[PDB]
Amino acid sequence: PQITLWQRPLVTIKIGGQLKEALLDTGADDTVLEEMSLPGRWKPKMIGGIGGFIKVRQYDQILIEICGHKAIGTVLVGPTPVNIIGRNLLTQIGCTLNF
Amino acid sequence: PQITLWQRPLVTIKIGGQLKEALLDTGADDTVLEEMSLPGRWKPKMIGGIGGFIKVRQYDQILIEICGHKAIGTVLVGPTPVNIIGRNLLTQIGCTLNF
């Protein structure tokens, strides 16, 4: 689909058997989700944003279905105030910016 | 232009007579630029992102030229780690997300 930007580009995703809403975010290198239960093993990592940094758990090769499109890749989990789909997954679903 | 997301979607902008590079950021409601000299009056404001909040200066009716497309609107200035073009300006240049 084509998505205009008069509102937040929020999309429904399914991950870890759970349904969530997440922001399609071209400004985010990596995907980061609020605290949630995920199956795998994980590595501690820290990511930097506007107000400083947060500590996250890195999960690799995690399946996500973003608006009915599957992708597998790194998901970070931690105290982000919003679920963010970053460019690492956006590229997999063929998402582009257009003007 | 159509822009893929294997790299950061950085674009050259002109604002306040100065040239900068900024991220086209669908995840950002508002445009926020690193500390810079801008003409005019302003108002204290706080914006929140991944690591917490920062205090910014809000400038209204500011002219920006983003990839050669003019837009006028609100620009926040403050200690963001990167210059961000947010949805308030992206809509003005007809920027959309497609997959």
Ligand SMILES: CC(C)CN(C[C@@H](O)[C@H](Cc1ccccc1)NC(=O)O[C@H]1CO[C@H]2OCC[C@H]21)S(=O)(=O)c1ccc(N)cc1
């Ligand atoms: C622009 C950078 C700082 C990157 N940020 C992505 C960005 O889209 C965040 C994503 C975001 C979105 C909502 C809340 C927090 C973070 N948006 C954001 O900070 O926007 C602020 C300016 O406008 C306002 O609208 C939303 C928050 C304000 S980030 O969230 O910090 C980020 C950094 C690293 C990764 N891997 C993933 C995300």
